[PDB]
């Protein structure tokens, strides 16, 4: 996997490749690693497919029960529920999760949760095996308060390079846009992003 989430002026955008791996065999070339845990709180999944799915399902359940009692949860709250599961079960989990959501008060927010189950609030986050190859690129190119089109290009160019060098990443580039306007899904095919 190669995944990332980037805050910008109007909110936050999540990005991911579509490759699932089983050794050197691609078990699924059209995977959806961007996952809804609430209307406008989503997550990027990396690591074990089974572990991250099981965690995401439990979080979605917790936030649905939260919403029934206390109304819309904050993005911080969602990240805290992810953390609790990842931290307390650190011995039995292989899950690198980026949590991203849109509040109207707090706007776009990104929390990354690495293997140990620590939480890190950042302007943008990158994760997955393919992220290693774009630390240099992303650090040099990220700016705060970018536009929607700029942020889409930033993610597209970043994941394009991650996919190019990482054998464990590939397929299509999926993206999910989180703003006050709503939820938009974007897809970008090899013929476009490869020749960037």
């Amino acid at each position: 996997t190669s995944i990332m989430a980037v805050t910008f002026k109007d909110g936050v955008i999540l990005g991911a490749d579509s490759r699932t791996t089983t050794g050197a065999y691609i078990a699924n070339r059209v995977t959806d690693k961007l996952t809804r845990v609430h209307d406008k709180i989503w997550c990027c999944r990396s690591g074990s497919a089974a572990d991250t799915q099981a965690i995401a399902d439990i979080v979605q359940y917790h936030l649905e029960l939260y919403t029934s009692q206390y109304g819309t949860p904050s993005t911080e709250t969602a990240a805290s529920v992810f953390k609790e599961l990842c931290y307390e079960n650190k011995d039995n989990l292989t899950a690198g999760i980026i949590v991203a959501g849109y509040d109207d008060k707090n706007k776009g927010e990104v929390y990354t949760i690495p293997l140990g189950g620590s939480v890190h609030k950042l302007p943008y986050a990158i994760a997955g095996s393919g992220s290693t190859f774009i630390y240099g690129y992303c650090d040099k190119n990220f700016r705060e308060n970018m536009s929607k089109e700029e942020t889409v290009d930033f993610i597209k160019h970043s994941l394009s390079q991650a996919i190019k060098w990482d054998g464990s990443s590939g397929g299509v580039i999926r993206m999910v846009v989180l703003t006050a306007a709503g939820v938009e899904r974007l897809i970008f095919y090899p013929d476009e992003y490869e020749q960037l």
Binding site: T22, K33, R45
Partner: peptide, 4 residues
């Protein structure tokens, strides 16, 4: 097992 499937990885991402």
């Amino acid at each position: 097992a499937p990885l991402x």
